[PDB]
Amino acid sequence: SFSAEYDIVVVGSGCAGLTSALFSRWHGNSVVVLEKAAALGGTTFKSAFAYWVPNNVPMRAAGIADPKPDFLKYVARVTRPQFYDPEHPTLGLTQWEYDMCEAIYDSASPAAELLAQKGALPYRHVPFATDYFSELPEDKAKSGRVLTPKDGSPSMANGGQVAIRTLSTAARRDGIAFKTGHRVQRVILNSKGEAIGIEALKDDNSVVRIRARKAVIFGSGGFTHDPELRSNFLNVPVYGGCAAFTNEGDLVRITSSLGVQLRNMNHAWLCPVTFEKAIGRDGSMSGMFSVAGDSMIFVDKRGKRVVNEKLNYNELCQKLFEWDGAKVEYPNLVLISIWDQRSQDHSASNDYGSAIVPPGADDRHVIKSDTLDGLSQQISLRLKKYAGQIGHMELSSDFNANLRESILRFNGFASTGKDEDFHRGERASDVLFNGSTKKEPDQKNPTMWPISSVGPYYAALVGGGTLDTKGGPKTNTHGQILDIHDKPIRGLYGVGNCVASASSGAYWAGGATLGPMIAFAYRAANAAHGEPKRT
Amino acid sequence: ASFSAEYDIVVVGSGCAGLTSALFSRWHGNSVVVLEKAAALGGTTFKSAFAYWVPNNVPMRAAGIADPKPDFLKYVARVTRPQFYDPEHPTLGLTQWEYDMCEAIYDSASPAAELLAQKGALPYRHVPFATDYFSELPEDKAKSGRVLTPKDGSPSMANGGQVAIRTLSTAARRDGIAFKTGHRVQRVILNSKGEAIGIEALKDDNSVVRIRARKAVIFGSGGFTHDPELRSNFLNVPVYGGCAAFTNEGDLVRITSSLGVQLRNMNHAWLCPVTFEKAIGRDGSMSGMFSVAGDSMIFVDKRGKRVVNEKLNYNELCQKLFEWDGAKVEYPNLVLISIWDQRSQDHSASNDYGSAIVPPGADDRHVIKSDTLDGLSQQISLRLKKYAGQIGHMELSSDFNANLRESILRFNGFASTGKDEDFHRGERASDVLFNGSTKKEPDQKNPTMWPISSVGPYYAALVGGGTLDTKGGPKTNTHGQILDIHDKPIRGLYGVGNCVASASSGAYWAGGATLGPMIAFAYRAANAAHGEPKRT
Numbered sequence A: 001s002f003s004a005e006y007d008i009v010v011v012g013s014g015c016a017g018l019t020s021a022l023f024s025r026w027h028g029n030s031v032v033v034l035e036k037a038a039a040l041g042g043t044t045f046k047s048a049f050a051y052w053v054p055n056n057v058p059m060r061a062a063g064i065a066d067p068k069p070d071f072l073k074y075v076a077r078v079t080r081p082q083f084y085d086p087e088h089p090t091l092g093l094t095q096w097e098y099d100m101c102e103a104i105y106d107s108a109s110p111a112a113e114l115l116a117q118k119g120a121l122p123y124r125h126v127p128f129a130t131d132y133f134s135e136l137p138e139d140k141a142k143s144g145r146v147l148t149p150k151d152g153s154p155s156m157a158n159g160g161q162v163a164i165r166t167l168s169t170a171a172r173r174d175g176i177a178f179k180t181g182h183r184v185q186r187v188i189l190n191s192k193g194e195a196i197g198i199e200a201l202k203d204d205n206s207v208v209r210i211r212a213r214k215a216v217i218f219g220s221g222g223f224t225h226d227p228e229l230r231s232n233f234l235n236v237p238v239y240g241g242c243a244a245f246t247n248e249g250d251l252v253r254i255t256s257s258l259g260v261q262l263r264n265m266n267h268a269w270l271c272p273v274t275f276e277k278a279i280g281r282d283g284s285m286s287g288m289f290s291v292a293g294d295s296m297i298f299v300d301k302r303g304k305r306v307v308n309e310k311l312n313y314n315e316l317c318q319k320l321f322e323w324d325g326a327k328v329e330y331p332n333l334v335l336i337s338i339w340d341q342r343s344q345d346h347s348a349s350n351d352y353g354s355a356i357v358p359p360g361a362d363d364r365h366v367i368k369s370d371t372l373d374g375l376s377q378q379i380s381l382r383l384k385k386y387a388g389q390i391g392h393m394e395l396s397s398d399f400n401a402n403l404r405e406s407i408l409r410f411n412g413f414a415s416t417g418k419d420e421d422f423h424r425g426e427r428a429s430d431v432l433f434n435g436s437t438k439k440e441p442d443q444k445n446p447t448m449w450p451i452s453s454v455g456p457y458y459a460a461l462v463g464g465g466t467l468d469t470k471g472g473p474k475t476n477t478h479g480q481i482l483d484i485h486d487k488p489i490r491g492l493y494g495v496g497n498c499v500a501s502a503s504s505g506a507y508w509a510g511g512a513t514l515g516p517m518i519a520f521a522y523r524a525a526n527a528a529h530g531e532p533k534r535t
Numbered sequence B: 001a002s003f004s005a006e007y008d009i010v011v012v013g014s015g016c017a018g019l020t021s022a023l024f025s026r027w028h029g030n031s032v033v034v035l036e037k038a039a040a041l042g043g044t045t046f047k048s049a050f051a052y053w054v055p056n057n058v059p060m061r062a063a064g065i066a067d068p069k070p071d072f073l074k075y076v077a078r079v080t081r082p083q084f085y086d087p088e089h090p091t092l093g094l095t096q097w098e099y100d101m102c103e104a105i106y107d108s109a110s111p112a113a114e115l116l117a118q119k120g121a122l123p124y125r126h127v128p129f130a131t132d133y134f135s136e137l138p139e140d141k142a143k144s145g146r147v148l149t150p151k152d153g154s155p156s157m158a159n160g161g162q163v164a165i166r167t168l169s170t171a172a173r174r175d176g177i178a179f180k181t182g183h184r185v186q187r188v189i190l191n192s193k194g195e196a197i198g199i200e201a202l203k204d205d206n207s208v209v210r211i212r213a214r215k216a217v218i219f220g221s222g223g224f225t226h227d228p229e230l231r232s233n234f235l236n237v238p239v240y241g242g243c244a245a246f247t248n249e250g251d252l253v254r255i256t257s258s259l260g261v262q263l264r265n266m267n268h269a270w271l272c273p274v275t276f277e278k279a280i281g282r283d284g285s286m287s288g289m290f291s292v293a294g295d296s297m298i299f300v301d302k303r304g305k306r307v308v309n310e311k312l313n314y315n316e317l318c319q320k321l322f323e324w325d326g327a328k329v330e331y332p333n334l335v336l337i338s339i340w341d342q343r344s345q346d347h348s349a350s351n352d353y354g355s356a357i358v359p360p361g362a363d364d365r366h367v368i369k370s371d372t373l374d375g376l377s378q379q380i381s382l383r384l385k386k387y388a389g390q391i392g393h394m395e396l397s398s399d400f401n402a403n404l405r406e407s408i409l410r411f412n413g414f415a416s417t418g419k420d421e422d423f424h425r426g427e428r429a430s431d432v433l434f435n436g437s438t439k440k441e442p443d444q445k446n447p448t449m450w451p452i453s454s455v456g457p458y459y460a461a462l463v464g465g466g467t468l469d470t471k472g473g474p475k476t477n478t479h480g481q482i483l484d485i486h487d488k489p490i491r492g493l494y495g496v497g498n499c500v501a502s503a504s505s506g507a508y509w510a511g512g513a514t515l516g517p518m519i520a521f522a523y524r525a526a527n528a529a530h531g532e533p534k535r536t
């Protein structure tokens, strides 16, 4: 038996849990939110809280249609490229993927509107944020879908903190109970196999059992920080990610005897990371969404550019895991970001995972030297320090010569404004996350400027990480966790990164994690409200 | 509820894992049944060459070829976990589990092979020339010698699997192992203490049968290549299928979903290029493309440019096909086009090892043909159109013809000097080793290349990425015992072969690197299962 009882028990206090809790409470249920950490907010707290809301009221107010068939074609084209077909009944998606994407379109705006109306998540529009693949002809609403917390800073970097504040303030105002230091570790079933509550491990190592009359809703985030799970499931061998450190995939263990379908386990939301911060478990670390610097290139261990440094983070991270079967190594396992004094002075940022950081910031990851040859010596020392993580990678014997050639070639591209090798700056999204730069009259392309012929020169190692994972128990479009016959496990719900995303390995646009997540919190809460009170 | 039959040991699947597990079990004196889902025995194993890679095997020792254990471990460690391999680390940078599993392979494969041969179940011959796939690594101290093959396999060895299933199943029958075909196991039955006490299987006629196991249920049920949902949701690359038996649909993943197991290595398969049209068309006789045929032959992408060494090890080459172009939201190499001339048609064709170049009389529906290169590109275009819904509506670039001419001029230079400046074709031993048949040419500096003909006819085939089978599933210890989430055996429950987690990660060490380890674990599993008390 149990020491407490509520209509709805919510696990986790990021976006998925707080919104699920609020929607549940507003239907009149009693609700508790159980949080494993000492503080609320999880990864959501660290985010910019961009949220991508199709057919939102700001768009409609501007007379911008977001036609539903074209919304589905955009997400289908990006999510399942090989199979996308406009003439196919579900656009080449499976029925489940199609229905999930449809649910996002149907429910995101009503969810966003209700949260705002109740003062839980007031927003402003981000009209100029373009979708990450807006150039595709399938995208018929290329900008307009993004919302952000109303009181977020101009950079929006603190959006997640603002959102956790407004969400949790409304939750307290409306009588939702909170318990921190409660690590849920078990779902309790009745004799009919229905979820009737949880067991949680407390700080002092005692367990408590808490009954849920109607539903247990998991919003417990991903598994980035269980290295075993991460390594065994993800399609790339990432070194970590900006996910909260308490996101260790507990739901995967919780459901291991429940007969669930683990889906999309092979995918994470990907991003490059400041490699030394991932290895060193810096909890304040962000994914490198904006690769800082215009007088800045990435080179491999041969001293050559291999990629557009301004490419969308979810795609750029994948470059780091290209495999060289002939040499039995990952040639790009870490890349080296190299920049000059101009970028140091005018492109530094504490936000969006920039490796270029302003005076006073933690600079332990920054490598520095007065010559290019000196820099390579310093980079070598850094590679040696982390040898056991990166295959004992070394700079090639012709590194310095190749680097000089790479800088000369790039400097040409920066003069003409045309990167003939990797097309840096030619897609809108490259400009979108370009970061701060020193204004230069008659810079031809804002993403490039010639690297100075004098030092000092700076560098940082860039490795591959996650925002968090996006695989877990499969749900229906109402957030109900399914058994292997696709039938709900009665009373059991999941929302957010702890369950399977329908987005496969794709990242549609800024806010493509939180926008869908709010839609499903709303659908989950609406369904959970309809549950009979049991046991 | 009750059971309609009872045995000491119940074995699920009749490929290598199941037959060997069953035989070892029976020879300890247990009663044994083998439950096979299909109408026929043998699974993927039946289709294989039955190369099996057996470290420190008796033929090697008899020939005076050393295979020191510490160096064996460094070879497999270096290949398996490249980022973390470290000769100074106590487990070489592997996890304790991976290290222990690799050690078990070295310790147990040879005694397993010896016993199966002694009993006449798997007589073998040595294949002294079969060389490891990364033989150039200094860690490999026994670069050749580890491979065995069924004694009566053909000279090419291509029917080895059929011979092995014949000798194994004949011995099994001889020694009183029971067989039930058309029995699709779908559930493990537990007692009140949560121990495995038997199975439920679905029969062809849709009746269900419950069969008690006194000591152990051993799964040898193969991988999940042919469950598209599981394949698509777990593997690190979006493969189109594979040469796995079509009945390999990952049943064990569903069976164990309520048993609290740890699914491990789910992100990896044994990978290989495939003749794309045979994967899409579900040709059950299809083999992975283990040798890419032809010396006067190149692979081009849809731009008409070479992108890869066509002679690269199959498990590595397959990965090239899934390179991702984030800027264009496409897989640039999703299919590559193998193009060859009459010389390669005549002298490199093969019915074996997944060759796209096939001799007269072989099924050649996948072969595209034209008298001119310009005609060939028109023919290739029609083929891409036919499969548009599978390959992102990929098209040849508008400058395909001109690029191809340039690619062939470049390659023809490389073929005459013997030096492929772009992709180093022929510079690693395995490129030469798996090069396939070629017309002997006195003037040839590099056996893997010869100039492409200045006249037609020309031939082409689409190449896509596939599997041999998957290699993730419930984690076992080195004794084949399926573990719960606290790393403790689920009593009575065993798994061997592709249905459980391989310790090889995404790596393919050598020819026979699936079957060799597999026999080691069948032996260890059977030895442990024999030790189980009789229960329920």
Ligand SMILES: *Cc1cc2c(cc1C)nc1c(=O)[nH]c(=O)nc-1n2C[C@H](O)[C@H](O)[C@H](O)COP(=O)(O)OP(=O)(O)OC[C@H]1O[C@@H](n2cnc3c(N)ncnc32)[C@H](O)[C@@H]1O
Pocket: B012, B013, B014, B015, B016, B017, B018, B035, B036, B037, B038, B041, B042, B043, B044, B045, B046, B047, B048, B049, B050, B051, B052, B053, B183, B184, B185, B186, B220, B221, B222, B223, B242, B243, B244, B245, B247, B248, B249, B251, B252, B270, B286, B287, B288, B468, B469, B496, B497, B498, B499, B511, B512, B513, B514, B515, B516, B518
């Ligand atoms: C495709 C292929 C693979 C291959 C090869 C050549 C080809 C064309 N050559 C190889 C080689 O020479 N050496 C080597 O090491 N590997 C080679 N491979 C890979 C290899 O064939 C496989 O790794 C290996 O044979 C797998 O053996 P295993 O015993 O694990 O699996 P199987 O042979 O596929 O048999 C599984 C059987 O189980 C039955 N099954 C499936 N589900 C059920 C249920 N529910 N109940 C009962 N039986 C079930 C399948 O029907 C199958 O028969």
Ligand SMILES: Cc1cc2nc3c(=O)[nH]c(=O)nc-3n(C[C@H](O)[C@H](O)[C@H](O)COP(=O)(O)OP(=O)(O)OC[C@H]3O[C@@H](n4cnc5c(N)ncnc54)[C@H](O)[C@@H]3O)c2cc1C
Pocket: A011, A012, A013, A014, A015, A016, A017, A034, A035, A036, A037, A040, A041, A042, A043, A044, A045, A046, A047, A048, A049, A050, A051, A052, A182, A183, A184, A185, A219, A220, A221, A222, A241, A242, A243, A244, A246, A247, A248, A250, A251, A269, A285, A286, A287, A467, A468, A495, A496, A497, A498, A510, A511, A512, A513, A514, A515
């Ligand atoms: C720096 C950064 C910036 C980002 N910016 C954006 C952005 O602007 N827009 C966007 O769409 N996405 C963004 N993302 C991704 C986004 O933050 C996440 O996808 C989203 O916040 C996940 O929310 P969630 O509720 O699923 O999980 P989380 O916010 O991670 O919350 C899960 C919570 O569950 C708790 N928990 C875990 N296990 C248990 C247990 N056993 N019992 C109890 N509680 C448990 C955790 O401690 C945690 O508090 C960003 C990510 C990062 C790292």
